[PDB]
């Protein structure tokens, strides 16, 4: 049973990517101790990231620079893991026909996402939702 449509980006696993937050033009970035944020600075070693997929629909967003795991705590806050859990799947879907979605697995029925506010700032779980332009992502080259 699904919470959420099937309407898929195709694939782009293949090489390392930029995940682009149109909301206020930031890239998502993982800092080294764990630190989830935005930044404006194509530049950043730490934006690269590369995603990788676990079964149909759901993805691992990791850092090359660091090899951590984008993950969403019970409290709906992004961070860094240093190991792959329950946490870490995202279910990555089309919104809007052309943007890319990142839905937290373990929170999927509440509809929990990856979204970047205009200031860069890390969106907290239960304050996204369908609609908002913080959740709608473009996987750039790097």
């Known amino acids: 049973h699904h919470h959420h449509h099937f309407n898929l980006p195709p694939g782009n696993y293949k090489k390392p990517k930029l995940l682009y937050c149109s909301n206020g033009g930031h890239f998502?970035?993982?800092l080294?101790?764990?630190?989830?944020?935005?930044?404006?600075?194509?530049?950043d070693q730490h934006i690269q990231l590369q995603l990788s997929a676990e079964s149909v629909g759901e993805v691992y967003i990791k850092s090359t620079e660091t090899g951590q795991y984008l993950a969403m705590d019970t409290d709906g806050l992004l961070y860094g893991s240093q190991t792959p859990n329950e946490?870490?799947?995202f279910l990555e879907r089309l919104e809007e026909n052309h943007y890319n979605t990142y839905i937290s697995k373990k929170h999927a029925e509440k509809n929990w996402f990856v979204?970047?506010?205009?200031?860069?700032?890390?969106?907290?779980?239960?304050?996204?939702?369908?609609?908002?332009?913080?959740?709608?992502?473009?996987?750039?080259?790097?």
């Open 28 to 30: 998502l970035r993982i």
């Open 87 to 89: 946490e870490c799947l």
């Open 115 to 142: 979204g970047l506010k205009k200031n860069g700032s890390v969106k907290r779980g239960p304050r996204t939702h369908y609609g908002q332009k913080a959740i709608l992502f473009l996987c750039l080259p790097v």
């Open 32 to 43: 080294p101790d764990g630190t989830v944020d935005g930044t404006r600075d194509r530049s």
